[PDB]
Design a protein around this ligand. Structure first.
Ligand SMILES: [Mg+2]
Ligand SMILES: [Mg+2]
Ligand SMILES: [Mg+2]
Ligand SMILES: [Mg+2]
Ligand SMILES: [Mg+2]
Ligand SMILES: [Mg+2]
Ligand SMILES: [Mg+2]
Ligand SMILES: [Mg+2]
Lengths: 106, 145, 70, 206, 63, 65, 141, 56, 143, 56
RNA sequence: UGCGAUAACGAACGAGACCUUAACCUACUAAAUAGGGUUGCUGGCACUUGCCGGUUGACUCUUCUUAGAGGGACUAUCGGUUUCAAGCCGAUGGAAGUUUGAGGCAAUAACAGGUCUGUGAUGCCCUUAGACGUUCUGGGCCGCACGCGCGCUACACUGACGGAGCCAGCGAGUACAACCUUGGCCGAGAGGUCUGGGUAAUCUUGUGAAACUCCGUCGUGCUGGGGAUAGAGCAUUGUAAUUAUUGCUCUUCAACGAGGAAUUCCUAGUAAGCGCAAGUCAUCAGCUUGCGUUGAUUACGUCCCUGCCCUUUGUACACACCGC
């Protein structure tokens, strides 16, 4: 009766990459099963967090450095689909590590 | 633009404001050479006068020179914003002013004297013959006045 | 100062006599053949390019290479 | 011959100086044959390039520096000194100016003149310091063609730089003058003088 | 100036107390088939040509 | 210094011992064969091994070793 | 509908995208014509491929380029590369192969990269030094 | 301490490690500091096979 | 055929525009002319002095035409360069902002620049026409 | 709540680290090894790996 | 590192492999948070059909973009050279033929190297309630006859100054705070203000960065090179700016015409130049980790020096030449 499409973006942010990919795949599969209009898994530029730190505590000896870094992986799945469907999706397909998140408002 | 035709040779080295205005060269440059006028200020003065900066201007006119002198003398009478100056804001409740020659030197001396009288940190430093504006003499400038 | 900056009618005349001759006229060339200094030389060159006499090769700022007609 | 109409209109002179002849910047790149074995193959006018500027992966193997054009080499040499370091465009411009000057002077091909100058500048025999117990005895040694060429290139550039230092004589002009001197083996130039000195040294230690 | 135009048949090892000199066997251009081992300063290769003043004087490995 | 490492060499030798036929001179094919056969974790390493095998084959083609 | 290709060109971080089409004979760059560019000495370089080919090939083909990244020289180089590509691509698509081959040969003969993309990207400026390989300055006095 | 280390190593082996290593550092008797190393099997020090394989 | 703004080699176009402005005598003066630096790093006011302003205005107009929508800060950034800051190395500090603003205002008054939505300014029709005319003139001169 | 994604992630990591540290400190008698944090909606699952599970 | 020769055989660690990144993909999977094509409306042109535009109006694409999955280089093919071995050298193709470039990790044994001023890491000693604990307040680390050490700025004409042209990549950036902050007006500036946009491929930001390129002004004079010390005012950060925090405005114009004995760094997108960038940060960049832009000269060798490594030698040394 409703069939009210709010236009819903699923964000998918993570560090672990393979896991994220798997999650995305799962989501896609779910969508296919439910048979909806959606834009495919858009992948955004991998933001890298860099922390340069002198390896030493005491600053004595040669001046050596360690670039410790964090990889951020950010994906978007845009669903032209209802509210109920979105809710259902949210309910099923949750894995550890990946930050599942929904915008909901076009 | 144009090569100086005609006989020429109109006075090498002019004397202005008790100081030596150099012949040929350029008006701005001459001003700079005077003890108290700088580059931008000189340019401004030239603009006010209405002479070309291209001209060498040791063959300058007398009227022009007079005008320049007047300009130097007076900030407030002519269109000079009065925060473009050497000195500004001085004595008790009053006006901004600057000199540009011998006069400028005198003014500077007076200021120094005042500072000395005050015995402020800066004044003290000046008296000593030292570093007023807190620059580190641990390494640098090992000779001094 | 090394002189060669003072301006005269006679000097001008000698400069003129003449644009003809010289494979190339370059401010540098002009000074020092002991002629009027830099700016003056440039001005002279410019003048020479008014009505024939010396035609150009380059046109750049300070690298101004000119040569006799025709 | 045959100015074809492209929508983006090209100047007439430019159109003329294209296609038919494989020219340099404006004028022709042909002739210039050295006629001095050693300096053939390592002074390369055989390769016709249109500007003294390439990406140029020349510094890679060993002898690819040979096949790099002469004008380019000159430009590179000019690019010396920190104040002027990098700035290849400027160098190119200077080179162009020099070429123009050369053209102006006694007509003649500028490239040819340059080549001649280079040839003049290469020292035949140079000394190299040997240990030999302790003292500074210097054995005279023959110079390899490429090396000689390089030296020549250097020397002229150095001379030009010297001329420039506190001077009207725009570096390009100085360079041109040097080249001219080399061509008419005068020993008024700096590079030539250096070469002569080297020769003398060699003679002394033989 | 009597100059001899020489040509490189074989590079006979890198020489000198230091690096920058090479022993080279040389068949000169005019009047061929008279081999001399002479020292060359720069980058050398087979078929390179040498300009030199003092020809008939064979060199040795520098100490 | 493109000296193919010891382990790689050993692997190549082993391959040769095993499957002298099914190792045709050309490279891609050899690589494929290697992949089919032995459990190389890396790609680069595998490629190297293949190359070595090819070299060995070539050598053989000019008499034994 | 019309026959067209998008050929990219590159140098360091400079990037160019040349749209080749059929038509009268535009060779445009960022809207402006081929003639400007405006490093001015390397205008010639930009021309160079065209010159090599001959003006006849552009009577049909219409190139319009968009350029980003790099500095000026790099950008120019990228543009040139794109230009070189584009004609070749067109030939491959819609013209005889022989012509294309000839073009390639010509490029090789006067190879200032052109078809081959330039290999070199800059080195990381690793610590203990102001450049990549260069170090600071030791003193043991 | 040494005995304990040995025991630990044995336990590890039993559990099924390819190899293990224990370092015990400090004043194991006497004032002067000593390091004491106790190991069994293989121990990959270099490369990425360290984060993947060796628990520290 | 088709006459365009881009076909002209920039500097020449700018010069032409300046000339046109001069001829008009109706771009309007700011009030700071030759009592102004033009950038926060430039140890010498404009050498042209009288004029110069017109040229600047023309340049600004051209920039506006080129781009989608431009403002004051951006313009300043474009204009400014290196301070010979002293014995210290060079920073990049932006040019005279007030001057730029004044120029923009003048342009608006003329009917070169038009106020845009989102932010900044774009181009008017009359201004565009003028630009085109200038370009044409330049082309003619070249010919 | 509501921060830059990267920043949020960093914060989470820090929290995890803190938790781990706490566990190390506190569950010494219990023989704690490591934590596993699963942040689902509503509930958050903090799994603990220790030897003496009963004790924990 | 291998090939070989061999009372040694087969092995492990270290190196390599590995990993990350830097390069190729008109071959896949993708996108109004990346870019284009047609077309709508629409601005200007020439005025024929054509040229540049502006609009997230439509429709469609994935080359560039990103970034997932894969391939791709193995010294490949050919030539010599080498006991026709390991390999090396040159041409060809190829995005790539320097271990493809760059790093990340990186053995055994150690050093009385540094750090108990990162540490609720800590032995012992000291101290231990007018503390050597804490905490306020004012200074000080910045003082100057003078040594050396990183550095920046210059000794100009390959420049300076004006205009004009005008192009990067790493990044970073706030809701309990006060972050980046476009766009509009005021101000010569600095900087103020109103307004936004951004928790960020969306907004700052195309960070239209410089060095560069073009036309003009000074022409080789301690000059307009050079910018120090100086005086004054205008700004900002903070509770507090004198012992100028920093910025800006005018003024002052010093030393220095490429630097002796010495000695550093460097082999390709390197060197050098040039700026940006975050780090620290209320405010301060001459510093630093990165980034890109411009982009060379000369080797592509050798043991002369320097260091280090081994081998054979000699040893009254073993806390080991600062030895005995
Ligand atoms: Mg290993
Ligand atoms: Mg390793
Ligand atoms: Mg400067
Ligand atoms: Mg072979
Ligand atoms: Mg590597
Ligand atoms: Mg952006
Ligand atoms: Mg001065
Ligand atoms: Mg610092």
């Amino acid at each position: 009766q409703e069939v009210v499409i709010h236009k819903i973006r699923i964000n998918l942010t993570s560090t672990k990459v393979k896991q994220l990919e798997n999650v995305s795949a799962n989501i896609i599969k779910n969508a296919e099963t439910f048979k909806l209009v959606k834009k495919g898994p858009v992948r955004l530029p991998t933001k890298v967090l860099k922390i340069s730190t002198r390896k030493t505590p005491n600053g004595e000896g040669s001046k050596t450095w360690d670039t410790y870094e964090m990889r951020i992986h950010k994906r978007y799945i845009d669903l032209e689909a209802p509210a109920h469907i979105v809710k259902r999706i949210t309910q099923i397909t949750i894995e550890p590590g990946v930050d599942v998140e929904v915008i909901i408002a076009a | 633009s144009l090569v100086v035709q005609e006989q020429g040779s109109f006075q090498h080295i002019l004397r202005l404001l008790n100081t030596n205005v150099d012949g040929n060269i350029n008006v701005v440059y001459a001003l700079t050479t005077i003890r108290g006028v700088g580059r931008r200020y000189a340019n401004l003065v030239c603009k006010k006068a209405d002479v070309d900066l291209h001209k060498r201007a040791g063959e300058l006119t007398q009227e022009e020179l007079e005008r320049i002198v007047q300009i130097m003398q007076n900030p407030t009478h002519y269109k000079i914003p009065a925060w473009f100056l050497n000195r500004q804001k001085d004595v008790n409740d009053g006006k901004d002013y600057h000199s540009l020659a011998n006069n400028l030197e005198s003014k500077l001396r007076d200021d120094l004297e005042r500072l000395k009288k005050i015995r402020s940190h800066r004044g003290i430093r000046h008296f000593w013959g030292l570093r007023v504006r807190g620059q580190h003499t641990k390494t640098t400038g090992r000779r001094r006045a | 100062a090394k002189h060669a900056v003072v301006l005269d009618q006679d000097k001008f005349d000698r400069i003129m006599k003449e644009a003809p001759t010289y494979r190339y006229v370059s401010v540098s060339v002009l000074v020092d053949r002991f002629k009027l200094g830099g700016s003056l030389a440039r001005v002279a060159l410019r003048h020479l390019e008014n009505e024939g006499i010396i035609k150009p090769v380059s046109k750049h700022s300070k690298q101004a290479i000119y040569t006799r007609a025709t | 011959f045959v100015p074809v109409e492209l929508a983006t209109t090209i100047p007439v002179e430019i159109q003329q100086a294209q296609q038919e002849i494989k020219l340099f910047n404006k004028w022709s790149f042909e002739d210039v044959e050295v006629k001095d074995a050693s300096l053939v193959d390592y002074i390369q006018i055989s390769k016709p390039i249109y500007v003294a500027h390439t990406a140029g992966r020349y510094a890679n193997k060993r002898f690819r520096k040979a096949q790099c054009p002469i004008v380019e080499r000159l430009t590179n040499s000019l690019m010396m000194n920190g104040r002027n370091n990098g700035k290849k465009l400027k160098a190119v411009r200077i080179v162009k100016h020099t070429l123009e000057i050369i053209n102006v002077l006694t007509d003649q091909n500028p490239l040819q003149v340059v080549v001649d100058a280079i040839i003049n500048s290469g020292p035949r025999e140079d000394t190299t310091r040997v240990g030999g117990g302790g003292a500074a005895r210097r054995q005279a040694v023959d110079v390899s063609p490429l090396r000689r060429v390089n030296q020549s290139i250097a020397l002229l550039t150095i001379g030009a730089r010297e001329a420039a230092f506190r001077n009207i004589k725009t570096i390009a002009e100085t360079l041109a003058e040097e080249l001219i001197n080399a061509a008419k083996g005068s020993s008024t130039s700096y590079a030539i003088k250096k070469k002569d000195e080297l020769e003398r040294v060699a003679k002394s230690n033989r | 100036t009597p100059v001899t135009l020489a040509k490189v048949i074989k590079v006979l090892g890198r020489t000198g107390s230091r690096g920058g000199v090479t022993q080279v066997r040389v068949e000169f251009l005019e009047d061929t088939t008279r081999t001399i081992v002479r020292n060359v300063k720069g980058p050398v290769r087979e078929g390179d040509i040498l300009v030199l003043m003092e020809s008939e004087r064979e060199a040795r490995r520098l100490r | 210094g493109r000296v193919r490492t010891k382990t790689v060499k050993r692997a190549s030798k082993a391959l040769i011992e095993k499957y002298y036929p099914k190792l045709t001179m050309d490279f891609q094919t050899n690589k494929r064969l290697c992949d089919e056969i032995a459990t190389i974790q890396s790609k680069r390493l595998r490629n190297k091994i293949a190359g070595y095998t090819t070299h060995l084959m070539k050598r053989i083609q000019k008499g034994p070793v | 509908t019309v026959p067209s290709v998008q050929t990219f060109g590159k140098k360091k971080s400079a990037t160019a995208v040349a749209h080749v089409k059929a038509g009268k004979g535009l060779i445009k760059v960022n809207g402006s014509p081929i003639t400007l560019v405006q490093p001015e000495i390397l205008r010639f370089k930009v021309y160079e491929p065209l010159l090599l080919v001959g003006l006849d090939k552009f009577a049909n083909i219409d190139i319009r380029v968009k350029v980003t990244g790099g500095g000026h020289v790099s950008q120019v180089y990228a543009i040139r590369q794109a230009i070189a590509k584009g004609l070749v691509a067109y030939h491959q698509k819609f013209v005889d192969e022989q012509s294309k081959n000839e073009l390639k040969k010509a490029f090789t003969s006067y190879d200032r990269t052109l078809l081959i993309a330039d290999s070199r990207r800059p080195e990381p400026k690793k610590f203990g030094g102001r450049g990549a390989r260069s170090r600071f300055q030791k003193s043991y006095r | 301490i040494r005995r304990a280390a040995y025991g630990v190593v044995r336990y590890v082996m039993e559990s099924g490690a390819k190899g293990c290593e224990v370092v015990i550092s400090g004043k194991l008797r006497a004032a002067r500091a000593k390091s004491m190393k106790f190991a069994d099997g293989f121990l990959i020090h270099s490369g990425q096979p360290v984060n993947d394989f060796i628990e520290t | 055929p088709g006459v365009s703004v881009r076909d002209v080699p920039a500097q020449d176009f700018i010069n032409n525009y300046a000339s046109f402005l001069q001829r008009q005598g109706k771009l309007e003066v700011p009030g700071y002319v030759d009592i102004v630096k033009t950038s926060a790093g430039n140890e010498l006011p404009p050498q042209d002095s009288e004029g110069w302003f017109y040229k600047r205005a023309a340049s600004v107009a051209r920039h506006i035409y080129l781009r989608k929508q431009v403002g004051v800060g951006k313009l300043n950034k474009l204009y400014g360069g290196a301070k010979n800051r002293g014995v210290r190395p060079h920073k990049h500090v932006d040019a005279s902002g007030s001057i730029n603003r004044k120029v923009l205002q003048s342009l608006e008054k003329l009917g070169v620049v038009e106020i845009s939505p989102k932010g900044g300014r774009r181009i008017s029709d009359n201004g565009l026409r003028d630009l085109d005319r200038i370009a044409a003139a330049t082309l003619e001169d070249e010919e | 709540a509501i921060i830059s994604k990267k920043r949020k992630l960093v914060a989470d990591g820090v929290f995890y680290a803190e938790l781990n540290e706490f566990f190390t400190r506190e569950l010494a008698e219990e023989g704690y090894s490591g934590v596993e944090v699963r942040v689902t909606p509503t509930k958050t699952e903090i799994i603990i790996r220790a030897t003496k599970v009963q004790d924990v």
